[PDB]
C-alpha cells in the first residue's frame, strides 16, 4: 500500500500489498517477464509522453497536449483541426506524421552483476563511467551482440542506471515510427482549462487525442509508406464504463521523468535558498515589467504572450516547490532519513555512510557562492535579457571579414544577418527589451559585486556613473544590432573593428564568458557528490530494504497505485474526487478563449444525451483525481481498474504536488485524470466517429 | 427564508422548534414583559449590537466601532492598529455623536393609521409613507407630553408591506456609550478587502462598548457623574460552541430588501444599476491600479480610494451572478403571473393593472435613469476634480463688489476648500489619467444633446481630443496647482474665477446630476402606490406566514442552521473555519494578512484554554443559513437556548442577491465565533475584568 514509482521488477514484492488496496487482478496478467501482459499495451509516446494501445488495430490513446503539435501541423486556416477537431471517418483518412515515434518496452532484464563486473576493469577508483550513458551503451551492445541492429529489425537495447548507480536494468525496445493522427477533440475541450486551470484541481479538461500504429504486413516496425497496415498489438486495454467511486482502487503505468527523493537536507536548502529563490525573484521582476507593457499595448501583448507564459511556467513551479518546503517539512524528513542511516551505520560499525553525507554537505556549502552567481546571471541576464542572446561573430566569421581578401566576406555577413533577423524577429521589441534590461540589470548589479561582474557592466560604475538606463541606451544607440537601419549601415560597409568594439556584442560576449566560467568552476563539484550519493543510497537500500522504497524516475516504465480520492487544499475547503460536465458549463465564458464551450457539447449537456457514459445519479463525469504517484512523463498514462480495465487517462498533477518530486505528499498530491467515459462521450456525441467505438472492447 | 417581525414569532415558533429551538416563546419576545429582545440594540443608527453583561457591556463588530477607535487614536499610541483595552471602567473612552437604541415596545397601529388615512382628500397622496405625517400620528396616539412624562422614551410609526401594515415603536435611547475594548486591526480586519463578501473568512470582527446612564438607569448625555447601566436583560455567553446542522437564530436590524420587485425592476437593476457601476468602476480601478503599481507613494495615496470603490463593485458582480445563474427574474415573473391569474378569476383587475403601471414607469424612466447612473458612477464618484471647490454666492459677492477685507475672507475660505480637495492623498496627474478614461467612456454612452454643458466642448472647441480637453482644464485653472492658485489669490478677479474651466466643469456636471435627480423622483410615487396594491394582492392570495415584509431598519428575527455550501462543481466549503486558516493566509508583506505576534504565539503554544473545541483546534468563524443583509452587522447569534454563540458581521457574495430572493443553496451569514472573541480578549487583550463580568455558561 506504499506510494511510489515502482519498477516492474518490484511487482512481486508489492503484489500482496496491492491486493489489500483492492487489486483483483492476477500479477503476471499485469506484468509477466516471460509472457504477454498489460505492460505490452503501454507505450512511450514521442519520447516524452505516455500512451496506451486500446484496440487490436493499433489504436493509441494519449493526451491532447501530447498530440498538440501534430494536430497543429495538419491544420490550416481554412480547415482548422486544432480548433474544430479531427475525426477520420475511415482508416485511409488518418494523417501521417513526421518525426513521430512510439516505443514498446518488450523486455526488461536486471544486469547489475554484469555491469559491476565490467566496472571492475578499473582504470580509476573514482571514474564516472558507471553513470556514463555512452559507456553503458557499449556494455549494452556487447551483451546483445555485434549487429543486433540487423538480426532484429525494430528492436534496440539500452542500459540505464538506478539508485545512484547501485542497480542496472537492460531494456529491449520496440520502436514504431509510422503513427498517424486518428481523432482529436476541439481545443475548447482538450485545452479547456488552458493556462488558468493548469496544474489546478478541480479540472474540467477533456485532455486526449487518438492515434494508430502502422507497420508492415507482419507487424514489424517500418517508416511511412502507403502499403503499411495497421498494427495488430500483442495486447491492448479494455475500456470500462463501470466508472469510478470514492476510494476505488486505481493504478497507473507510465514513464515518469525525474525525481530527487534521495536529496540530503543540505540539497533541499540549496534548492530553496539558491535555485528557487533567485528564479522567483528575477522572474517576478521580468514578468512584472513585461506584464505592464502587454496591458498598455495590445500589439506588445500578442508579441510577448508566449514569452510571458513560458517564463511563468518554471516560475509557478518554483513557487509551489518552496510552498512544499515550508509547509510540508521536506527538509526535516530528509534530515531524519539521513540521521537514521547514520545512527544505523554507527551501530553496524561502518562509518562510510556518515562520511558520504558529510562529503555532500561540505561540497554543497563550498559551491554556494559560485552557484549563486551562476543562477543570478542565468536567471537575470541569460534568460531575462533578450539582447544577451544577440548575434556574436564567430571566430571564422571574424577571420573572413578581417584581412581576408575573398568575398566570402559577404557570405559571413549573410550568416550574421540571418541570426540578427531571428533575434530581432516579429515578436521582438527593443523598447520592451530595454525596460526589462534596466530592471533586471539593476537587481543583478545590486546582488553581484564589482569584482565578480562580467567585464562589461563594470562600465556602469566606471563610465556611466551608475546610470543603468544610460548604459542600456548607449548599447542600443551605437550598436549594429540596435535597429534595422543600423545593421544595414554596417552590412553596407562592414569592418571587423566596428564589430570588435560593438557595445552590444561586447555585452553578450562578456555575460556569456562569465556564464561559462562559473559553469566550468562549478562542474568539478558534481562528481564527488554523485559518488557520495551512490554510497548514501546503497546504505538506505541495505537498511530500509528494497521493497518499501523506489529508485528516482529516469524516463523508465514504472507502475503506481492508490485510490480515487479528493483532498483538502486549505482550511474549511474540500475538493472532491470527481468533476462533472456541469462544472464545464459553470465556467463557460464566450469572451474568454480559454473557457469557450463547444456548441455540440452544450447541446449534449442540455439534452442530457449521455447514453451509457453517465453514472447512476445521471450526471456526466469529466475528470477525477487519485492518490497515485506521478510526475512529468506520466503525461498520457493509462489508469486501470481493479481488473486492469481502462477507466481514465492521466494528464496532469495539482500544483500542491510539485513537491512530490522530492517527497510524496499524501494529503495534497493528486494525479489529475480525465474520465474514459467522458472520452468516449466526446468521440460519440461530438466527434460522431462510431467506428472507433466499435473498434474498442467495452466491458459492462 | 424570512426577516420576520417580532409579531410573527407566534406563527413561526412551532417551525422554529421543529428545526431545533428549545426555548420558551415569551423569553425570546414578550409583548408585555421582559425578554431576550431587550438585550438587542441598534448601534449608532447603522449597526446592531447586544448587551453582554449586567453592567451595560455591549458587543458589536469591529467595522461598526471603527470610526470611534480611530477617533481616540492619537499620533502614535494608536489603538486602531495596536488595539485598545481599558483595564478599568474609569478609562473607558466616551464617544460623542454615538447612540444606542432599545426597542422597548412594539404594537400594531394599522387600523388606527388607515382610518386616519381615510380622512385625506387626494387619493394619490404620499402621506401614507411620509415620516413627517406618520410621526405626527405617533405623537397623537402617544400623547402630547409623552417624552416629558416618559423619560428616555420616544415613539415612532413605520410603514410595512408597501403601506399595508403599520407598527408603532417605543424607543429608549442612550447617548453615553463608551469604548471599552478593541482587537488590533490585524485581527479585526484580517479579511480586509481581499476576503470581503468571501467565505471561508478568518476575521475576528468585533469591538466592545459600555452603556452609561444616570443614578436611576435613565438615558443621559455624556457626564462624569454617569453610572454604567444595569440592563433588565443581557445575553448569556455559551462556550459549548457549534456543530454542523445546529440550530441558529439572529436578532437585528436589516436595512433594506427588495423581495417584492417585479421582473422588469430586476432587469432594470441589472442592465442599468449594476452594469453601469460594474463597467465604470472597472475602468476607474484599472487606471488607479496601473498608477499605484508604478509609484509606491501613489499606492499610499490611493490605497483607501481604490479599496472603497471595490466594495460596491464586488457586490454588483455578485448580484449580477445571482440574476444570471439563479434566475431571479424568472421567479419574479412567475410570482406576478400567479397574482394576475388569481385576480382574473375573482373579477379583480386592480392587481394586473398595478403590475403594468410598474412596468410602464420603469420603461419610461429607462433613458433618464441610465443617464443618472452614468454621470454618478462616471463623473461624480468617478472623477475627483468633479468635487473641486465651487465659489458660493457670498464669496462671489465679496471678491466682486469691491468694498472690504471681507474679500480676503472669501479667499481663505476658498483656499481652505482647495487644500481639502488637493490634499496629501490627491494627485493631479493620476486624477488627469482617470478623467480621460472615464470621460472617454461617458462621451461614448451619452449623446451631445444630453451632455453636461461644459463636456460638449470636447467636440466644439477641441478636435474630439479628450486628453487636450482635460489638459486645458488643469492648465489655465486656478485649482490646477498650488502655484496657479496663489497667483489668483494675489490678484483675485471674479470674471476670471467665473470663467475657470475647472469650476465650469464641476458646476455643470453637478447641476446635470441634480437635474436628472429632480426629473427622476416623480417616477417613484406611481411605482410606490402600485406596489401597495401589488403586495396587498400577494398577501391576500397566499397569506401572512410565508412572506415577510421588506427590511426597513426595524428589529427582525431570522433562524436557520450552522451549515456550509457548495460554491461550484466538486467544491465544498465547510461550516466552520479555524485558526489554522489564519496562519495559512499569513503574509507579512501584505497589510491585510498580517498575523498579530501575540496571536501567533498563542497558536504555536496551543494556548487556547477553555475556548478550544472538542478536537483541540481553535475556532474563528462559522456560517449559517440565516437570512441577513446590510444592517445586520454585529447582530447576536443564538443557539437553541438563546445563548450567545457569536456575532454576524458579513455575507458571502453568492448571497448578495438575497435582498431580492433568498438562495438556500448559497446564501450564508458569516459569523465570528464567540469562543474566538473571548480568546482575543483573554490571551491577546489581557482584559480579564471583561471575562468575569460576563455570565459564561460552561
Residue numbers in the entry:
A (entry chain A): 21 to 720
B (entry chain B): 23 to 720
Text lifted from the article:
Here, we show that dipeptidyl peptidase 11 (DPP11), a central metabolic enzyme in these bacteria, undergoes a conformational change upon peptide binding to distinguish substrates from end products. As previously reported, the overall fold of DPP11 comprises a bilobal architecture. The upper helical domain dictates the specificity of the enzyme and caps the catalytic domain, which has a typical chymotrypsin double β-barrel fold. The active site of DPP11 lays in a wide cleft running through the middle of the protein between the catalytic and helical domains, which contributes to the formation of the substrate binding subsites.
We determined the structures for the inactive constructs PgDPP1122-720 S655A, PeDPP1122-717 S652A and its complexes with the dipeptides Arg-Asp and Arg-Glu, as well as the substrate Leu-Asp-Val-Trp, at 2.4, 2.85, 2.2, 2.1 and 2.6 Å resolution, referred to as PgDPP11, PeDPP11, PeDPP11:RD, PeDPP11:RE and PeDPP11:LDVWs, respectively. PeDPP11 and PgDPP11 superposition yielded a root mean square deviation (r.m.s.d.) of 1.4 Å for 629 out of 685 superimposed Cα-atoms. The binding of peptides to PgDPP11 induces the dimerization of its monomeric population, masking the real thermodynamic contributions involved in the binding process. In this way, we focused our thermodynamic analysis solely on PeDPP11. Indeed, P. gingivalis dpp11-knock-out strain shows growth impairment, suggesting its critical role in the bacterium energy metabolism.
